[PDB]
Write a protein that binds this DNA or RNA. Structure first.
Ligand SMILES: [K+]
Ligand SMILES: [K+]
Ligand SMILES: [K+]
Ligand SMILES: [K+]
Ligand SMILES: [K+]
Ligand SMILES: [K+]
Ligand SMILES: [K+]
Ligand SMILES: [K+]
Ligand SMILES: [K+]
Ligand SMILES: [K+]
Ligand SMILES: [K+]
Ligand SMILES: [K+]
Ligand SMILES: [K+]
Ligand SMILES: [K+]
Ligand SMILES: [K+]
Ligand SMILES: [Mg+2]
Ligand SMILES: [Mg+2]
Ligand SMILES: [Mg+2]
Ligand SMILES: [Mg+2]
Ligand SMILES: [Mg+2]
Ligand SMILES: [Mg+2]
Ligand SMILES: [Mg+2]
Ligand SMILES: [Mg+2]
Ligand SMILES: [Mg+2]
Ligand SMILES: [Mg+2]
Ligand SMILES: [Mg+2]
Ligand SMILES: [Mg+2]
Ligand SMILES: [Mg+2]
Ligand SMILES: [Mg+2]
Ligand SMILES: [Mg+2]
Ligand SMILES: [Mg+2]
Ligand SMILES: [Mg+2]
Ligand SMILES: [Mg+2]
Ligand SMILES: [Mg+2]
Ligand SMILES: [Mg+2]
Ligand SMILES: [Mg+2]
Ligand SMILES: [Mg+2]
Ligand SMILES: [Mg+2]
Ligand SMILES: [Mg+2]
Ligand SMILES: [Mg+2]
Ligand SMILES: [Mg+2]
Ligand SMILES: [Mg+2]
Ligand SMILES: [Mg+2]
Ligand SMILES: [Mg+2]
Ligand SMILES: [Mg+2]
Ligand SMILES: [Mg+2]
Ligand SMILES: [Mg+2]
Ligand SMILES: [Mg+2]
Ligand SMILES: [Mg+2]
Ligand SMILES: [Mg+2]
Ligand SMILES: [Mg+2]
Ligand SMILES: [Mg+2]
Ligand SMILES: [Mg+2]
Ligand SMILES: [Mg+2]
Ligand SMILES: [Mg+2]
Ligand SMILES: [Mg+2]
Ligand SMILES: [Mg+2]
Ligand SMILES: [Mg+2]
Ligand SMILES: [Mg+2]
Lengths: 64, 144, 117, 201
RNA sequence: GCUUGACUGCGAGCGUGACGGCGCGAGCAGGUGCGAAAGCAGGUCAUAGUGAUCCGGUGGUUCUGAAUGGAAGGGCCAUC
RNA sequence: UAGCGGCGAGCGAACGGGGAGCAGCCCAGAGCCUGAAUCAGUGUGUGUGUUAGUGGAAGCGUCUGGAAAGGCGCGCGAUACAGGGUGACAGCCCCGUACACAAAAAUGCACAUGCUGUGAGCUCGAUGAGUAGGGCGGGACACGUGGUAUCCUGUCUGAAUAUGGGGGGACCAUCCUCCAAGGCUAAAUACUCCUGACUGACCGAUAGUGAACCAGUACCGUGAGGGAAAGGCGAAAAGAACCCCGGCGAGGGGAGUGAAAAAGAACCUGAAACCGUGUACGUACAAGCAGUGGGAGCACGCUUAGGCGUGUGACUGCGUACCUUUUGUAUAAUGGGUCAGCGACUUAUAUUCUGUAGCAAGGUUAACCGAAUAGGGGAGCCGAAGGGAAACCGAGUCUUAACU
């Protein structure tokens, strides 16, 4: 049968033009008052999945 | 050319691995699985994304965004597609008739990709700044 | 495509049992035991192609020593003497001469002694 | 590209694309193998340990008997047990890309021409459905093992050919890659050559 | 003494991590404080004072809005 | 995919598109004209099938052999060279096969034509209430109560009824669309205890059914239930008259049959473990994985008369099996009494990468149609554009009031 997407992964990663994946940074959901504006500002843009983790993401998203 | 003088191309037919057929094969005994543990077992191995119990990457990162229903009914047309319609009048129905866009597409944009050389009239479609200049340079026109 | 193994299995077992001819008891009769015996015979044969070269040189040396000492010189001085005389005759041949041509061996000893003189 | 006739004395003209291309052995091989795979029926099965007739009772207790542990009388280790990877009916057919099929046929036909195995004729007919007549016609033409391709498949020639095992008679629509290779000679009517010309072009 | 730079948007480059992350940062834009001025200031001599994701709450933002206009709900930003 | 989801594991649509197949009607009611229609039922024609059957071509000589269908030579049939049998492999010996025919009787079907009931059509009405909806509890919907539409209803309630009502995914307005609470309806779809025919890169007696055989038997169990083993003389029984030893035995030796009896029924082939008889050599002062390297002697062959070969192996150097598991095993750790047979990385569908082939800014079709491995079918799918959560913009885009 067709492989099933890991649906939680599909909600967290989007494939980019050269076949990497963008994700949102962790640590910007709550407990924000104590965090420096600089730290939070750098967490706001999307980031690319690292080399070590790409295998895990690709396994989860066969139809990306 | 006989049924007993045909050969496959060199490199086209690699023999499959056969595990567990003795020492000389190089895949005897353990069959490439190493010694013991979950991965050596029949049916053995952990599920996709499992990292040993550490919160996995697809759960320690946050969800983001929503899915647009409008994006699914919006297409992009290349300049190369404009010559492929019948009659040199590009609109949503003529693009559908030429199999350029799907039946359920409601909105389409012409972008600067490929080349237009024939003169064409684009009707009821959005056109990029660059596509507009290319269509008009090729003698065409864009009707809003 | 069911494949029966009997013809090939028989030929393989018979090949091993033929190489185990002369071995004692189960070693010439029983495949499981004969197989181990044939492997070990092969391991020893490999080792002993090296050992054969050691054992023969040891034998030649012992005989040269006996013959040299009958002519009033030790092996170690005899060999040194031959090397100083530029005689390149090897130990297989010297030991052969020591047994089969004692006058020629004596001539080699006198050559060795002259080079040491 | 010219092909000459036999019963009429002419030089018919055909395409270099169809009847003059180089022999692509790898392509032809793939299509011939696919054709043989498509002939397979794939009808068989064995019984897994689930399907062998017998009870699910554990043959003897897990511990204490001094025997190897047993779970099922149907174990594939056991005489009368299941087949470990019991066969099921299979579909052995392969996909052949349409262009690869047509490319293979062009290679085959071009090679038949190069090897002087394609014989073009104006007409090939028999007066009656009599095997003796066709046998006489073929020995006249110095043919024994031959594929005969006609425009319209007539009853008389089809019936005359049936009991000659070395002879087969097709219409141009019924050509297949294996039969073009398998027969020693291929006889084509001028009509059939046109139809194969149009089919491949 | 005077003050709100414990600023907002960004950030060359670098450190440290398997990763998630964490850290240092001149400089650029806007607006600000102190100083006559050069200047200094994006918290505190530095290194501890912390908790991913989910689910939900509050404010902002017509980004989305299942016939259409709205709305609900969702997104995005801030925050709990 | 959209969604659902301790937003975990997992679950998973629809809209819309391409196909197969297509078929629409009746009551909730009178009247008018009439019973015409179409379905059934029950009769008889009419073909056409089924359940027995009939005919069905063409070969001889010679060689080998127990036997010819084989070899060799020369003929003949073929709308028949499917297949099976016959003393080895047969188009022409036999049974068939292609093809052409056949039914007293029963019966299926398709027509046509009698007959019983069913009653067409047309104006004029009518239009399913403890129901829809609601509250509570559950269930069903991909949808876990969620912002949750829609469906079902155990419980308590309860409309409007065409100027009316349902739905369009909370809800409202507008617009669109449909008409619940009565019912019938072929085809395309599912399956095979069973019957016929045909097929297989399916098995070939530990396989294939549990069962090739008097097997769901023997046997086991109070019972439900469990559940085997076990095929082959030969072409033909010509299955061994008769004689001899023996207990009027068993068993054997002759004779005879046969191509063969070491095919003799304990029967094709007849492996291995295992057990014997015979011969050569070794072995009764000698210590251990039993071999290996060296090696005398003896016996028997042999083509220089030479050594050479084969068997044996006194004496001597070296030398603690195999598997597994381990840091590490002669290990006194595991496993194996031996042999023979069987016994473990497969299959399907998705997906990615490599190789290879085709075509190439294109590539490829699925179901299905087609007698078609052809051909048709481009519905789709992947690719030629990305950025952004998204609207949206687009070789850019996002970020930000704006970017060095
Ligand atoms: K491996
Ligand atoms: K034929
Ligand atoms: K500043
Ligand atoms: K003959
Ligand atoms: K026959
Ligand atoms: K109710
Ligand atoms: K309405
Ligand atoms: K059974
Ligand atoms: K059985
Ligand atoms: K020894
Ligand atoms: K251990
Ligand atoms: K133990
Ligand atoms: K693959
Ligand atoms: K490929
Ligand atoms: K940029
Ligand atoms: Mg937030
Ligand atoms: Mg290895
Ligand atoms: Mg192991
Ligand atoms: Mg381990
Ligand atoms: Mg491992
Ligand atoms: Mg298991
Ligand atoms: Mg834990
Ligand atoms: Mg299309
Ligand atoms: Mg077989
Ligand atoms: Mg033996
Ligand atoms: Mg079985
Ligand atoms: Mg096709
Ligand atoms: Mg301080
Ligand atoms: Mg401090
Ligand atoms: Mg939750
Ligand atoms: Mg709306
Ligand atoms: Mg709506
Ligand atoms: Mg006949
Ligand atoms: Mg025979
Ligand atoms: Mg109604
Ligand atoms: Mg309702
Ligand atoms: Mg209700
Ligand atoms: Mg409700
Ligand atoms: Mg309810
Ligand atoms: Mg419920
Ligand atoms: Mg509603
Ligand atoms: Mg059986
Ligand atoms: Mg057998
Ligand atoms: Mg008797
Ligand atoms: Mg015999
Ligand atoms: Mg026989
Ligand atoms: Mg026998
Ligand atoms: Mg002694
Ligand atoms: Mg003593
Ligand atoms: Mg002893
Ligand atoms: Mg020792
Ligand atoms: Mg240990
Ligand atoms: Mg050791
Ligand atoms: Mg020990
Ligand atoms: Mg011991
Ligand atoms: Mg042990
Ligand atoms: Mg153990
Ligand atoms: Mg043991
Ligand atoms: Mg895009």
């Amino acid at each position: 049968p067709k492989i099933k997407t890991v649906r939680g992964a599909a909600k967290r990663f989007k494939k980019t033009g050269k076949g990497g994946f963008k994700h949102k940074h962790a640590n910007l959901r709550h407990i924000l008052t104590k965090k420096a504006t600089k730290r939070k500002r750098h967490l706001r843009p999307k980031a690319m999945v690292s080399k070590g983790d790409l295998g895990l993401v690709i396994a989860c998203l066969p139809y990306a | 050319m006989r049924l007993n003088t045909l050969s496959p191309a060199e490199g086209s037919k690699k023999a499959g691995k056969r595990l567990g057929r003795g020492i000389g094969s190089g895949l005897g005994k353990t069959g490439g699985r190493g010694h013991k543990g979950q991965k050596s077992r029949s049916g053995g191995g952990v599920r996709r994304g499992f990292e040993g119990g550490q919160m996995p990457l697809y759960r320690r990162l946050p969800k983001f965004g929503f899915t647009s229903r409008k994006a699914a009914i919006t297409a992009e047309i290349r300049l190369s597609d404009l010559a492929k319609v019948e009659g040199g009048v590009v609109d949503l129905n003529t693009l559908k008739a030429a199999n350029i866009i799907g039946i359920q597409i409601e909105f389409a944009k012409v972008i600067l990709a490929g080349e237009v050389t024939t003169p064409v009239t684009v009707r009821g479609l959005r056109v990029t700044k660059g596509a507009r200049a290319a269509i008009e340079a090729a003698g065409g026109k864009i009707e809003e | 495509a069911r494949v029966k193994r009997g013809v090939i299995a028989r030929a393989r077992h018979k090949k091993i049992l033929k190489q185990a001819k002369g071995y004692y008891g189960a070693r010439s009769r029983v495949y499981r035991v004969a197989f181990q015996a044939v492997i070990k015979a092969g391991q020893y044969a490999y080792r002993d192609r090296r050992q054969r070269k050691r054992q023969f040189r040891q034998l030649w040396i012992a005989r040269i020593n006996a013959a040299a000492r009958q002519n009033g010189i030790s092996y170690s001085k005899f060999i040194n003497g031959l090397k100083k005389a530029s005689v390149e005759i090897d130990r297989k041949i010297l030991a052969d001469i020591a047994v089969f041509d004692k006058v020629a061996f004596t001539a080699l000893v006198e050559k060795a002694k002259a080079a040491l003189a | 590209m010219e092909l000459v006739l036999k019963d009429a004395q002419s030089a018919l003209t055909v395409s270099e694309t169809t009847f003059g291309r180089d022999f692509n052995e790898a392509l032809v091989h793939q299509v011939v193998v696919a054709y043989a795979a498509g002939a397979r029926q794939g009808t068989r099965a064995q019984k897994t340990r689930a399907e062998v007739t017998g009870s699910g009772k554990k043959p003897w207790r897990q511990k204490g008997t001094g025997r190897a542990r047993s779970g099922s009388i149907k174990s594939p280790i056991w005489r009368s047990g299941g087949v470990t990877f019991a066969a099921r009916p299979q579909d052995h057919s392969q996909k052949v890309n349409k262009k690869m099929y047509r490319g293979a046929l062009k290679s085959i036909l071009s090679e038949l021409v190069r090897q002087d195995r394609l014989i073009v004729v104006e007409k090939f007919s028999v007066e009656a459905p009599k095997t003796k007549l066709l046998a006489q016609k073929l020995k006249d033409m110095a043919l024994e093992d031959v594929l005969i391709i006609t425009g319209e498949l007539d009853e008389n020639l089809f019936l005359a050919a049936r009991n000659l095992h070395k002879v087969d008679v097709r219409d141009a629509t019924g050509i297949d890659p294996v039969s073009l290779i398998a027969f020693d000679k291929v006889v084509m009517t001028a009509d059939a050559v046109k139809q194969v010309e149009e089919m491949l072009a």
